[PDB]
Amino acid sequence: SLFEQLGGQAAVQAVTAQFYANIQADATVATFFNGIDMPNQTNKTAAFLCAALGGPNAWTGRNLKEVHANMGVSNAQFTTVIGHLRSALTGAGVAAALVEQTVAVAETVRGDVVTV
Template identity: 40%
Template sequence: MSEATPNQSLFEQIGGEAAVNAAVDIFYRKVLADYRINRFFDNVDMEQQAAKQKAFLTMAFGGPNNYTGTDMRNAHARLVKMGLDDSHFDAVMEHLGGTLKELNVSDNLIAQVAAIAESTRNDVLGR
């Protein structure tokens, strides 16, 4: 991953689209392998889900996106009915941080990504 320079955006500092692609692969595997949360991913099309993860990570990495709070709410409403709560959101946050650590992203950048992802919590949990 590239070194931080003052003029680069967060997205560029992390490594742009190539970093997103590398991250999706690690992140989605972590999520699917986690018994605390993987039941929420039963019966979903894996390719579509990977594409959604890519869009999510692009947004969290500060990249170009069209995400809105309403999209987040609608997309997760079914899961909230299934019992999705803070503990599950925390687990996903944990995997996001772990993924970036594996990719040798600096702690400073990880904190910025985490802050963006954290900002979706209330929408995801439908509150």
Template identity: 40%
Template sequence: MSVYEKLGGEPAVNAAVDIFYRKVLMDDSISHFFDTIDMDNQHAKQKAFLTMAFGGPNSYSGKDMREAHKGMNLTEAHFNAVAGHLVSTLEELSVPQELIDDVVGVAVSVKSDVLNQ
């Protein structure tokens, strides 16, 4: 069974993305990255990406992680802030720690691309 299925499929991913972006947009250390972003579009892209990354149906057609974050000058602190909001979102949704660990593994697997290293 995929992480996507274990999390609860589309409704769970949709809820997680909505909560996650509320947390991100309230964080002054990273919210400025989204000042000029169409957040409805961003939510849709994030839902499709996480669905694919967690082993669900692949309808993600956006840029790869390196291209999507190119030129943003993201640092380890930015990455850690976003990852922390993802973890706290999953905890808020009562996701078991084992699945949170799996999700963190997916996030860490794209870290070098996100940071353009």
């Protein structure tokens, strides 16, 4: 599973952590996460990706389409975050092919987060 090729639980965690960091460091999207609990965002998202990446414990949390309704996220902006995931995976040492495969799974949620 990509989850395994990636190195497991801790690997997805570390990558997600860097993911949000790269987000808050980007002016163009950092705004949506204003006054947002970052360690929680890191944890939930991690849980979510492990599941989507083939992990053991599947996703239980809220419906993402529902979570992000009326949030003002645009495709450009979503794309930008995806790039934050890609840079995060890259600086993490992930091999190119795996990066894109992980980013590919992340992209599936584009339809549930983008609303404008």
